[model samples]
Target: EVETFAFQAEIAQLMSLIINTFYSNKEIFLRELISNSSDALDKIRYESLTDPSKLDSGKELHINLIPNKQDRTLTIVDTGIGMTKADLINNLGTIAKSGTKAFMEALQAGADISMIGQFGVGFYSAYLVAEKVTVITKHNDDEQYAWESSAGGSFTVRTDTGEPMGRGTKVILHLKEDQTEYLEERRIKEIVKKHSQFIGYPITLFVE
Candidate 1:
């Protein structure tokens, strides 16, 4: 089990490129994050069937979105298998998966890049809109940890002290001025339906 790993400089440049060009569509951020949550829930469910004790204490497998217009903050919460610090770094800080390399190879080969979602890294789409993002996650095998970043070059991870929500993750987005469209309920719903309606999980909106 790896404890810590630093991101390669090339990965940092790639992330900046992704933030600037590949994810110009802000609405798709919600879709990608929800899809990621659904995948996490699916993994946990599969694990639970094999090891009954691994069942999440939280019964619902759902994603919830709460947008606060006053603070321009959007919170997305999910009941799924959360991440440990190593998992957080591997998932967020580096292109540690095979799909990312394959996606880049496909792009170099002049193949369509639309299918890159199959390679993961979809959750990082949140950075397209958020000036700052925070992830609060609790995993059954490890203690809760919070991963935060501003899409600038650095990220910090620390143990979470708040009440753990059984098992799952919550991502809070502090939206930039240009990305307020995510604050609207109808818009969010439309995006979710368009990209993730067939996803095998429930998505809820906490609209005022």
Candidate 2:
């Protein structure tokens, strides 16, 4: 059984800002998410190379994008190092310091804003165009779980009730009406290649 954790207050604020500001290049959300997925695949691949059993799951390391125009939904799935509950909170919530005090101190001290990108808050950018987002993931050492959220300050997690896939993670985005442009394959492919082509994993766009 995996334990669950909630986002800290400051992290929540940061998430809200990320979602709101992410509209600058709405299409880049796809690229950022895919890049993140590619990184995960790379991590698992590196691990597998060291231990033969790690590759027992499958040797493929790639990213797949599925868009549903009818339902106004987009799904990005990948085989990567899936997260545990603690990981979800730490990675998604709170910056790398002790608390908001530290985060504020850094901001007041004139720290470079660019450094935040290295902190892994990239996943929260999904809320820019997605009214609701769901993350289904399976870890090599834990039971599968689904994390659901709407940019509204709270998220819920439950035991995954869907069919089991091998080790991987799937992100389902409920697209907003105005953001329908992202539903097209060419748009997604262009965005992926522009921002993530140099990433170390294969990314596929599924129009079906």
Candidate 3:
């Protein structure tokens, strides 16, 4: 059975602010997502050093950017430390539990964009372009699950019944009408080069 949850009070406020300010310079969403995948990749690698079991998905770690023009969606896939149901609730559902409350303060202060990763709230930037977001993830120790949300309200988490994803997370952003620029491979390559060029792991963009 699928479980639904309301966004934290602060999270609602946070999304509203982001929606209202959905400015033109919203390409930071890609940067934020790549950074998240990189962090997850690092976590699994660090854990595997102590317990090789963490590398059950194998030592290969990479991120894939797949943009489907027909679907108007961009999928960011990562061979990283995927989240459990609890992680989904705690990490994505409740923004207050993370550094988002403070991150909101900085947003209003017109602080430097470089401060986003420091606060750990960069995931919210996905809302800048997506009307809906779905996260499919599988952790080494837990069954795969899918989490979906439209923001400003509630989200749902359910056991994934699709093909076994092995391990890692696939974040799919259903783009809004005006945000389709991100569906271009060339644009994604440029964005990756500009924002995540120094990331250690290989990030491949699906071309076709």
Candidate 4:
């Protein structure tokens, strides 16, 4: 069953600020996403330290960046700790209600915020270049879920019925016309080098 919900007020405001006003340096979207994947991989790695069975997927933890020019989409795939349906709704649907509201105001007031880190809203940075974002994820303990949004007033979450992902998350960004530069191998490599070069796990960009 696919369920959709309107964006919370603060989230809608933040997306506006991110997609429009703060569009100066949109390259950080890749950095923020890679960092999030690293975090997810780290989470599962840590969990496996105690349980050992979480590594049952047998896939090494890594991030893959696939830029499909024909489709005009950039996909970031990670073999990491994925989310459940509830996590999909709660994490992606809403912001830290009261707290991020103030953050949004500061942004509106022209606060020179450097990073999208502090508020756990880094994922929304994808809106800087993507017209639509889709997240398909599978958690070891729960059914797979797919979450999608277009930075509009609402977003949707549905149980995915496609090929089973043993465990991980795959984020696909449907790039806007002007954002097609992100679909180039060299550009992606440079961004990864500049921002995520030192991150723990390997980040591979598929080049064809």
Candidate 5:
């Protein structure tokens, strides 16, 4: 989500850059998100070296694929360190002061997808073939929140009262009209095996 600052020059330029680069590939969205998920798990695991208290959570480390063919949606769920409300705004919301500035600098330096993935813009790559992107996440200390956008340079967040994610994130990509090709099990496997299989985590694919 870019934010209400869509009118801002710096944000506009940076967002445009992300859209251009990520949208061109269109298939690597899974790779970027999985990389982030793996990183999140690594973060929580590393933190446990100093604080074992955070490691006792019931959540285990794994990623799940819940594909809804009727809904034309593909959801990537992870048992990683999730985000908080402030994180939703600062990490996913590109309009935040520091977040936008970081992206501005990163894009200005001509960072590629892997580099930009370190910024707040990587989530937007979901919009490459998805008209709408919905993220539901829960951190160990924060209540769950839902962040969504339609690639319009602005996204909205709401306090979700539904069943919490417990401790992880669910990135749901509502695939676009012509992008329904992703619905095929074979295509999904090809994309993941080609771009994401060796990332140190087992990515399960579910067709139901």
Candidate 6:
């Protein structure tokens, strides 16, 4: 029970559109996620040049996809710079970023708007296939915390005392009833091969 918040009115509507309007193409969620993790890795690596403590010694940047068929869950973990509380609130809990406002305006104009074409690194795609999504992250600049939601306008943020992440993020996706295919390693591997095979970071898939 660290901090709890409801989405801002405008941002809530924006998230609602992302949740209800987009249909399922679950694998692409991994693509956007890894792409973002790569970007975060690059930023932290560069920052470390001036401040060595910004990173742990000999830490390699990578992503891990762990799926638990029993739990009907899939998780993506990244050894990249994790998000700060502000970043989580702005990026995940609300739409303080550039696109949501414009997108809502376009919808009002009846432009047959698409959530396609470079839509702010594509986080909402997670809701397209998950009943719930939880993001646990540790930033070099901030204390570790978790952001969780069921794709509703309300999300909660709480500091978790389990263990510090050091510097990275773990995103757990609880699969939607009709979208369990993503939890199978074979299906997920095929999707990653098709979607993010050449992505800059090292990506691994784990099923046990």
lDDT of each: 0.75, 0.72, 0.84, 0.84, 0.73, 0.75
lDDT of 3 by residue, 1-208 (tens): 9999998777777667777763677888999999899988998999988899778776789999999999999999999999988888775523454576787678688875446667877777788889999999988978999999998678899999987888988999999999999998789989998989999999889976
* Segments in model 2 whose C-alpha atoms lie over 4 Å from true places: 1-6, 21-23, 92-116
Q: Write the per-residue lDDT of candidate 6 for residues 50-116, one digit (tens) a residue.
A: 9887776337878888999889988888878788888898864333445667666666776433343
TM-score of 6: 0.86
Clashes of each: 0, 0, 0, 0, 0, 0
Question: What value of lDDT does candidate 4 attain over all alpha carbons?
Answer: 0.84
Task: Score every model by TM-score.
Answer: 0.86, 0.83, 0.93, 0.92, 0.80, 0.86
How many residue pairs of model 2 clash at the backbone? Answer: 0
**What TM-score does candidate 1 reach?**
0.86
Better of 4 and 5 by lDDT: 4
Position 21, candidate 5: lDDT: 58
Better of 2 and 6 by lDDT: 6
Q: What digit string (tens of lDDT, one per residue) describes model 4 on residues 68-103?
A: 999999999999999877778876523556646666
lDDT over C-alpha atoms for residue 177 of model 1: 97
Model 3 segments more than 4 A misplaced: 93-95, 112-114
Predicted structure 1: lDDT: 0.75
Worst 10 residues of 1 by lDDT: 1-10
Candidate 1 lDDT, tens digit per residue, 94-140?
35456567666776877543444655766766777888888888888
- Backbone clashes, candidate 3: 0
Question: What local lDDT score does residue 175 receive in model 1, on the 0 to 100 scale?
Answer: 95
